[PDB]
């Protein structure tokens with residue numbers, strides 16, 4: 001009956017990226033959520049024309065302030081961030097995260113959206129500001145490209161990914177989920193923990209599917225979050241999420257972008273299709 | 281496939297009004313839709329503080345242009361409009377509706393969102409602009425407060441609501457659904473091929489925030505799925521009644537919690553044909 005999640009990410013009028021993926025998934029899981037937008041764009045940035053604007057600092061401040069003063073954030077237990085068009089919004093979000101976490105315990109999943117397949121699709125000022133943002137997170141979900149940028153290491157293998165994670169765990173970050181580390185005809189996901197006394201690092205090997213991956217990572221993020229919110233242990237929540245995503249992609253015609261609307265009946269799938277491999 | 285609906289209305293970060301209700305409902309009905317925002321507000325206007333801004337004309341034009349140039353609106357069959365914070369967006373929408381309707385067949389439902397219970401909650405410039413907007417709709421869905429404003433007639437009874445619809449029909453408005461008078465009235469200009477009707481709904485006490493928007497999008501969804509209009513209205517009002525009966529005391533209806541009821545097929549009320 002009250003809002004449990006605050007999610008700060010991008011919005012597109014048509015298509016499924018950022019907070020618009022968030023909306024479909026968290027609504028379908030029936031998780032009450034505040035969606036604060038960082039953009040109001042016609043369509044994602046992969047098109048030749050991208051109408052609309054980033055949200056202005058002063059409007060973002062105004063929004064956050066109104067949520068606070070009207071007590072619409074009083075029961076937030078989860079915070080998620082995603083895409084930012086500008087670093088000022090990132091620094092402001094840091095201020096907001098600090099004030100949230102000073103008051104109460106809130107689990108912050110930072111999806112450090114910067115780029116993919118070795119190419120950034122964010123401003124350089126955002127890239128730099130994201131290095132500061134992640135330090136406040138409870139769990140981060142970079143892809144390999146993101147992880148490389150965040151740490152300054154090459155990430156072309158699981159062993160490199162492990163080294164890279166270690167640098168971020170030393171900064172205080174408790175949990176790092178690395179998506180789409182490369183391996184022959186497959187892709188590896190790595191879940192790495194700062195506290196390896198009480199938690200076990202693991203990998204999942206996923207067969208590579210050819211086709212358009214617009215919105216894939218964002219979908220994974222929100223499906224994972226939703227199962228975390230429901231109380232599914234993290235190993236299981238990861239396996240469910242990547243299992244669901246594989247199911248969605250197997251039911252997408254290859255050239256088409258995944259249609260999250262059409263795949264609503266699959267979102268809450270509980271199949272855990274892959275093997276959890278503990279790394280030694 | 282492709283986008284079938286374009287919906288232009290307000291957005292709130294927390295709560296369920298305007299295009300945020302739209303998103304939940306159309307997404308649950310699995311109707312592929314473009315949601316162009318006219319605001320980006322923290323919360324609805326009923327709070328003591330309302331953070332955020334209306335969308336700027338130049339950003340609105342940029343978005344519409346980008347939808348067109350990337351072909352993302354080429355297959356739209358349905359258009360809905362709702363809340364606008366300023367009259368410039370209304371006039372620009374009118375330009376976009378004209379260019380849609382000149383060469384494609386698109387069913388435009390205009391929900392002329394101005395006010396309720398005899399009090400407006402929109403700018404007077406938006407009130408004036410809405411008299412122009414409605415002139416391009418295939419169907420409009422005023423409440424009685426809205427219909428009274430749009431015609432300058434008192435609307436305090438069905439018979440007054442009938443008279444008010446007639447003046448708008450004489451001006452070309454083809455279908456008018458008047459949502460609360462409690463009586464709903466569906467009035468047609470062409471009474472040769474369609475039959476005007478009313479539905480009597482028992483009055484429920486409580487908070488109605490997002491009620492009207494919820495009705496609009498459930499009605500549209502059923503129109504889209506090919507249910508005949510009279511039945512689509514019955515389902516929509518039937519579903520809202522069910523949602524309201526399950527809402528406790530002072531709370532606003534929680535569309536997220538009620539997702540399983542949105543696609544309800546019950547037709548709980550009686551369609552009454554009038555003279």
Ligand SMILES: Cc1ncc(COP(=O)(O)O)c(C=O)c1O
Nearest residue numbers: 010017018044045046083121214
């Ligand atoms: C606004 C926006 N554009 C684009 C993307 C990624 O899109 P693309 O890879 O198609 O450029 C995201 C997030 O993943 C986004 O939020």
Ligand SMILES: Cc1ncc(COP(=O)(O)O)c(C=O)c1O
Nearest residue numbers: 290297298324325326363401489
């Ligand atoms: C932004 C916005 N605020 C408010 C409302 C209605 O608000 P109120 O709850 O003041 O009646 C609507 C639509 O009905 C809206 O779109």
Ligand SMILES: [Mg+2]
Nearest residue numbers: 113143217218
């Ligand atoms: Mg990503």
Ligand SMILES: [Mg+2]
Nearest residue numbers: 393423492493
């Ligand atoms: Mg209304």
